[model samples]
Target: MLSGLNHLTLAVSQLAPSVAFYQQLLGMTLHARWDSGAYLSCGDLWLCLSLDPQRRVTPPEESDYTHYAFSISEADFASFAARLEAAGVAVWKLNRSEGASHYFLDPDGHKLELHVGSLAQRLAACREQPYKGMVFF
Candidate 1:
């Protein structure tokens, strides 16, 4: 059977600043770094920042629903959101889902989200107020 996610690598334009963004702001643990890449972790979620000078820095398209989400505790949600606001990270989307979430941009403009719910919680929510064509197995 297939297991959980192994890692995610983002092609960032600048190496050091991107490192700082993940390390300082989002508080991902810095594992290691090379000349062209870095290894970091938010718990077991391995994140790699690869140097790519040609990486896009354009605004996230409003029609694009793809984004990565990191889990956050409800206790720390409001304060952490304030910190992101203080740091001036551009919010890409607003909360329109089940849990409290902060959708924002990285230094490289990659769409990322901080959410306060789990898959189980979401499925339970779906059980109560199911979406269109939702069928529980």
Candidate 2:
């Protein structure tokens, strides 16, 4: 049986820039570093940045809704968005009835999101929307 998430690993074109983007921009702390990869911590979640240019994917077209989201507080949303913009990150807004989300791509074209609501809040709001049956665990 599944217990819980262990970590998430991402393949990046270059290790240094990816490390800087996550450390400087996203506030993730570097836990360790290796020749081809690095480990970082975002709150309690462990993120591994691996150097893999051969397998890197280009940024998704706007129509692609796939992304990994991180929860942030409403009070911190504006400032966080500002910081990301100030760093020249390519940021986009995603609208939803439950809450707001800021989408952006990392240096290696991986999509990420900063969401200003909890999963519970989103699930509840989604339950009341027109697409009721579409929302599931």
Candidate 3:
């Protein structure tokens, strides 16, 4: 049997900016830390931000088409979107089969999504069709 997710890791050129982005923007707390990496948590989800300069990290340009989505309540979604906008961050509106969402690129150009939970449920409703390699199903 498969277990639940332990953590998602991403390599970063620098740690401080990525830490601030997750902590201040997404309201994730620093769960643990070290000289080269940090663990951030929002509820049960864990994000590992690694400061490995020589390592092959995913470039932000690739995130323009790729993304990692997180579910949030309506209030939380609105607050995050509004706060990013107020700070003059670039956010693009994205409409999906599951629900409406917006895209924000982190300092390292990783695309992070704040999606409405209700919208996620609706999108999952179409899972029976099995159109492609959609992992969420």
- TM-score against native, each model: 0.94, 0.87, 0.76
lDDT of 2 by residue, 35-54 (tens): 99999999878899999868
Best by lDDT: 1
TM-score of 1: 0.94
lDDT scores in order: 0.91, 0.82, 0.75
The RMSD of every model to the true structure, in order and in angstroms, is 1.3, 2.2, 3.8
Compare the candidates by TM-score and give the number of the best one: 1
Q: Per-residue CA lDDT of candidate 1, range 14-45, in tens? A: 99999999999889999999999999999889
Flag the better candidate by TM-score, 1 or 3.
Answer: 1
Q: Candidate 3, residues 1-44: lDDT per residue as tens digits?
A: 87998888978888887898888866789888899999998888
Q: Which ten contiguous residues of candidate 3 have the minimum total lDDT?
A: 55-64
Query: Which 10 residues in a row give candidate 1 its minimum summed lDDT?
Result: 57-66
Question: lDDT at 30 for candidate 1?
Answer: 95
